[PDB]
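User: Assemble these into one structure.

Assistant: Restating your components, then the assembled model:
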Amino acid sequence: HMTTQDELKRIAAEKAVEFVPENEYIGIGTGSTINFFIEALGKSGKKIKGAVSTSKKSGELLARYDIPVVSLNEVSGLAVYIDGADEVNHALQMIKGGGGAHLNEKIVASASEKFVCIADESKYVSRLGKFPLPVEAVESARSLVSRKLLAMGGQPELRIGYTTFYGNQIVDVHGLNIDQPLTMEDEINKITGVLENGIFARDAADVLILGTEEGAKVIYPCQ
Ligand code: NA
């Protein structure tokens, strides 16, 4: 039978354990692929000095698997950040935030010395953009941010009924042409009322572990 998507996620998560140094502070992403990774890291027996969480769920699983959790404010930096992606291109630039956590994810990534992305094969794309782009905005700026995103060219859609970790809203933007991921990352963030967007170009991954039918493939940015 074909390997299921969950099995592909587990393949990538299990391989990523090998990338985690012992006795260091590390950062932990969010999502279903990460949830398999937290379990695998706990089962490995590796000594972890402390882990910084990016979501309520990730923090709960770290505790379930006996991995010590620390606030980002307690450390001067992290040795490695491990996280998933909704899309990842050949330069290892990513679209993130399908699960609502892109603000905390980018904060923790930006404090880390290395970013390991874990994903099943379906996330690896030639061009970023098909997956709608999450944008976090404060509630009173919803209509304003939406007009500004529409003027940029995308179709803004409020994520109905959703409240982010820090109490804000997400507008998901459909149909963007992303010529230059770093330029668009910065231009969207210049909209007043936007707190963060899901383009990870400045914080592109350093290495990608991709779960495929042939096992876990290790992929560095294209030359
Ligand atoms: Na997310």
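The two ends are 35 Å apart (CA to CA).
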